[PDB]
């Protein structure tokens, strides 16, 4: 069987994404896949990188450095727990989906969070495991991305540019660099605008796609695929 | 005389990026300029993007779109205060600066939620009314990042690719978008790494193209810039 982690950041349960997340449960509940949701904006989850994110006492009170402070609290069991229990889900999870609509070509600042915080060194990566053999090889991870903007508008001679020049830093510097193998994006352009046929078409495109999402072909996750 | 906000974004004073901070304050200080800065961890700034950041009536309550609700409370003056007190620094702002950590190929959520909360539509840019028709039209905007990589892994065939690469969503998906001219990025590499002297050589080099800073021009924001 399969364990999946949708990792799901949008405020309101009746918007578009929150239709994409509860299509996914669906169907990969229905498939035998063992499901996990981590609902960021419901568990209030904290986004900031501070000394907070250790318990007990700091490797140096002096001068704080958050990326070895945490390495080393990783190592030795002392993280906060909000942590550690999304590292536990990362850990046993096959497949971790993050469903998001795109802020500011990116995620939101608390998914942001929730990257910047819970794949630290000693977890995601280390020294010999950046990129292929990053510590959370095997892994599949697959971004699924609402937009304001129309598909058109995401060409490479658009203003936007193109969609895969936005997914680099998620995909290549983050994604990758842990290990992941990255399926190609899902993304549901512009819905706010479509029409209600549309939007149906979107959601169940997903659901679809769900299907046979474990016989689907990681991308090559290169400089040249995004550019 | 101009009016400088820089972002600052390290929990740490003690920091390089800390260091980079008060280079910047004493320099254009130095200059006679009107210096603000906002020190994101210190306010212990909020980053998420939700409800509490409107206090009036809710235009459509029965479904919460944060756009919508944020461009409505923008237009009634309804926003939270720690969003409209950094749309003052901005709107008076003739230069922005970021300094910041590069996390993850972009910015620390503290600061992701700084641009996802203050640039709101109505504010910084409208539908239509971006890119060069962006709301801040007139501002310059500088990113002044520091990397735990080395300038040799991001090259256009290193590991991490071209440092360019990651500048797209924030120099032209974010700071282009509202309007801003984007200067030319400062990007001090793997400071962690670098010796004592090659640090203070970063510091001073921040330090020295600060003096001749308003006699720069912006990049050509593009496509071609970032990915040639
Ligand atoms: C701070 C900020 C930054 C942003 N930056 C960008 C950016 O850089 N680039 C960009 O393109 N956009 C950007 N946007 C716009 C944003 O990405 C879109 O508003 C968002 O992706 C839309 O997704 P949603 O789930 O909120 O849509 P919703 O408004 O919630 O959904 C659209 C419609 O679909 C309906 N719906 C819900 N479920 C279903 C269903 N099952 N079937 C049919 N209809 C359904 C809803 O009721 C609604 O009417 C930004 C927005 C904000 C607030
Ligand atoms: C969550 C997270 C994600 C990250 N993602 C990435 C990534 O995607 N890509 C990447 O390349 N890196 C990444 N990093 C690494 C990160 O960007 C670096 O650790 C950071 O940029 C270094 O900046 P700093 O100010 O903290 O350095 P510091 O550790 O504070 O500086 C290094 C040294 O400079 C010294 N120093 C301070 N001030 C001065 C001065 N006045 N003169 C001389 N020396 C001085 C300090 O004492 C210290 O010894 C990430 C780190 C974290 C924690
Ligand atoms: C413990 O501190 C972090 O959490 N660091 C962190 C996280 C993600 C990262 N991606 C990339 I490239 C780097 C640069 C790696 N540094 C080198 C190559 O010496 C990186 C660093
Ligand atoms: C809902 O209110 C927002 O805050 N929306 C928001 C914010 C930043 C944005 N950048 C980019 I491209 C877009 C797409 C704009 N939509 C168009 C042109 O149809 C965008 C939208
Ligand atoms: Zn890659
Ligand atoms: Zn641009």
């Known amino acids: 069987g399969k364990k999946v ?5 949008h405020q309101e349960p009746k918007s578009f994404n929150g239709s994409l997340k509860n299509v ?3 169907e990969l509940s229905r498939q035998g896949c063992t499901v ?3 609902d ?3 568990m209030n989850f904290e986004p900031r990188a501070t000394d907070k994110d250790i318990t007990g006492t700091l490797s140096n009170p002096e001068v704080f450095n958050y990326g070895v ?4 609290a990783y190592k030795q069991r002392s993280l906060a727990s909000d942590i550690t229990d999304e590292q536990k889900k990362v850990r046993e999870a096959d497949l971790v989906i993050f469903q998001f609509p795109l802020y500011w070509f990116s995620v939101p600042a608390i998914l942001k969070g929730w990257m910047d915080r819970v794949l630290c060194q000693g977890f995601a990566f280390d020294i010999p495991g950046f990129y292929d053999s990053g510590l959370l090889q095997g892994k599949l991870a697959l971004l699924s991305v609402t937009t304001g903007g129309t598909a058109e508008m995401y060409t490479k001679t658009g203003v936007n540019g193109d969609s895969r020049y936005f997914l680099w830093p998620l995909q290549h510097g983050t994604l990758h660099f842990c290990g992941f193998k990255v399926l190609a994006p899902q ?8 029409s209600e046929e549309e939007r149906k078409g979107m959601v169940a495109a997903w659901s679809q796609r769900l299907q046979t999402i474990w016989k689907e072909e990681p991308i090559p996750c ?3 695929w995004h550019f």
């Open 5 to 9: 982690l949708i990792v799901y950041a």
């Open 24 to 26: 996914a449960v669906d």
């Open 36 to 38: 996990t949701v981590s």
């Open 40 to 42: 960021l904006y419901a």
């Open 69 to 72: 402070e945490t390495h080393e």
């Open 187 to 194: 993304i549901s352009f512009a819905p706010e605008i479509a």
């Open 222 to 224: 290169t400089a040249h």
